[PDB]
Write a protein that binds this DNA or RNA. Structure first.
Lengths: 58, 58
DNA sequence: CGTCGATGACTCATCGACG
DNA sequence: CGTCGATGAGTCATCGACG
């Protein structure tokens, strides 16, 4: 029937919306996680710049 | 009058879908640039270890 | 209260894939 | 060809904001 198809499409449409939100969430967690690493990597670089300017003494 | 509102809503729905897409594009751009920046900060940290392990000569 | 635009949910129009 | 599920678009339900 057309009633049955209309009902299968209602689930298809909600599944489509769902994985749109799922995609938004992965992307947002990805940038959250790259920001953390950015800061990790950038402070380390900083800690290593000081080790350089302190070893070039003597 | 029903017609006119139905038309104004068609435009609102279009605007809604478009800024969902604009949101996805900004999110993917952010990931792209944080990635490239990570690469930059990680190669730099790596080059700085080697200045350290070579200023470590005495 | 009615009316606005925004947005989630429902429905319709198409799509490519399948047989 | 008819039929499937996926997805963009149109439509309906409902929201908070306005006045």
């Amino acid at each position: 029937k057309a009633e049955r198809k209309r009902m299968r499409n209602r689930i298809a449409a909600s599944k489509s919306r769902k994985r749109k939100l799922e995609r938004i969430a992965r992307l947002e967690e990805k940038v959250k996680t790259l920001k953390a690493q950015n800061s990790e990597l950038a402070s380390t670089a900083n800690m290593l710049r000081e080790q350089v300017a302190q070893l070039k003494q003597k």
